[PDB]
């Protein structure tokens, strides 16, 4: 019956079944999903199976200065049109099938390590093209609710940085994973730390700190050492601009504790100029590749002390057994100093 026919929108809303108890709680999963297709896309007004040529609708109205008359394509001429539409339909299906693959993160199914692009431009014509965003954690949080039972939300941790010392991180929360990405990355750009870098490649000194139960021990390293650190630290260090560092994470390996523990330690590092100003002495760098040449890296801006720094015969500094065990050749690990890809 002609009167029982419906519109395309009605037919797709029913067939897709996007509203319903199946889609409310994700009670139904979709390895095979009906996909909406626009069936009016490649259709031309006036074109039908019979192949009639209507002047002014599907063919030009005037030809050679005279009005065209009703005509019909030959059976052969119409087969070509039909075949051409099928090929054009498969070409469109293949153009959509040809989608550029995006690089993976720490693993194929992991979100961690994936770039989200620069933060969105602020309302007042503000732009952050110089900043890159990296995901550090994507979690599904399940909230028990008074009336709706277990609901599913997304908590995202992302870090931003420009590669020149300015970096920050923020948590994002939303029901949708892509809204959480927007919240986290946009908020992080307003909570940027500045991290001082020695020679724009490493930290100024060894940093060992604890944040809650996460211990992070970082070592200053020379050029060419690379980033031999927890994969999350590697991600953050590329955003800050540190190229050479060793780091070891102990205790709880909690991503959030690690991120803010890492940023707390890197933001409280004393530069060489601050050391010279604090002690009013020269800072002299001795490099074995340069032999005994003394390289003054920092000199005090104020007066220069005349009294040498007291030489305590034995320092009362606390040592790490892991560092000492390594220097004494008593550290045996099959996993240490393994060959890995450039980081």
């Amino acid at each position: 019956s002609f009167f029982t026919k419906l519109t395309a929108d009605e037919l797709w809303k029913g067939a897709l079944a996007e509203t319903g108890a199946g889609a409310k709680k994700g009670r139904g999963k979709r390895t095979k999903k009906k996909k909406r297709k626009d069936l009016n896309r490649g259709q031309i007004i006036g074109e039908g199976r019979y192949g009639f040529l209507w002047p002014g609708l599907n063919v030009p109205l005037m030809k050679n200065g005279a009005v065209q008359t009703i005509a019909q394509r030959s059976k052969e001429e119409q087969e070509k049109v039909e075949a051409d539409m099928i090929q054009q339909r498969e070409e469109w299906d293949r153009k959509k099938k040809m989608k550029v693959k995006r690089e993976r993160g720490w693993s194929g199914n992991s979100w961690g390590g994936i770039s989200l692009g620069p933060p969105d431009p602020g309302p007042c014509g503000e732009t952050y093209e110089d900043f890159d965003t990296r995901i550090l954690e994507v979690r599904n949080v399940f909230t028990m609710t008074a009336k709706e039972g277990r609901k599913k939300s997304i908590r995202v941790l992302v870090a931003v940085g420009n590669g020149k010392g300015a970096a920050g991180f923020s948590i994002g929360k939303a029901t949708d994973r892509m809204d959480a990405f927007r919240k986290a990355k946009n908020r992080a750009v307003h909570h940027l730390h500045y991290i001082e870098r020695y020679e724009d490649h490493t930290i100024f000194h060894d940093i060992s700190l604890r944040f809650k139960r996460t211990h992070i021990k970082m070592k200053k390293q020379p050029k060419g050492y690379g980033l031999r650190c927890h994969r999350a630290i590697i991600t953050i260090c590329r955003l800050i601009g540190i190229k050479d560092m060793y780091a070891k994470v102990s205790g709880s390996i909690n991503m959030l504790s690690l991120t803010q523990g890492l940023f707390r330690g890197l933001s409280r590092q004393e530069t060489h100029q601050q050391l010279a100003d604090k002690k009013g002495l020269h800072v002299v760098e001795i490099r074995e590749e340069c032999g005994p040449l003394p390289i003054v890296v920092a000199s005090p801006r104020g007066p220069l002390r005349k009294d040498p720094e007291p030489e305590d015969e034995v320092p009362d500094v606390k040592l790490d057994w892991e560092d000492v065990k390594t220097a004494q050749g008593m550290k045996r690990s099959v996993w240490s100093n393994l060959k890995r890809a450039a980081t």
Binding site: T7, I45, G46, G56, L57, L61
Partner: protein
């Protein structure tokens, strides 16, 4: 909960027209009727035939002007004249709108045996009353 002819609240990104935004209880209060004829007045006949004709004319024009209609049809009957007033978009070339007006008016005049006129009002885009 009532469902009939109610566009449901969403995230604020769904544009609805004036007609779509008003549930049935607003008919004759905030929105008028899309067809005007005498068949539903007291003491008048042939309401069934006018109703079937209206259902056909709405489907006919939907498929005759595919993707061009920007709102529901307004059907007016005076005597034996049938006036179809449609708000359409400005995407199709004017030649195609004149062809379909001549084609539709003639075909409908012979189908229902009455003088039929089609009045097209073009808009650059669908007129948005609110974003639900």
């Amino acid at each position: 909960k009532n469902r009939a002819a109610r566009v449901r609240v969403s995230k604020g990104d769904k544009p609805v027209t004036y007609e779509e935004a008003h549930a049935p209880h607003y008919i004759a209060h905030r929105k008028g009727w899309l067809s005007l004829h005498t068949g539903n007045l007291d003491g008048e006949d042939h309401a069934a035939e006018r109703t079937v004709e209206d259902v056909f004319l709405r489907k006919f024009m939907w498929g005759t002007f595919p993707g061009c209609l920007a709102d529901q049809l307004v059907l007016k009957r005076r005597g034996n004249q049938l006036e179809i007033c449609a708000v359409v978009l400005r995407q199709l070339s004017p030649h195609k709108y004149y062809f379909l007006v001549g084609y539709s008016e003639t075909l409908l005049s012979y189908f229902y045996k009455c003088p039929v006129r089609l009045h097209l009002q073009t808009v650059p885009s669908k007129v948005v009353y609110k974003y639900l």
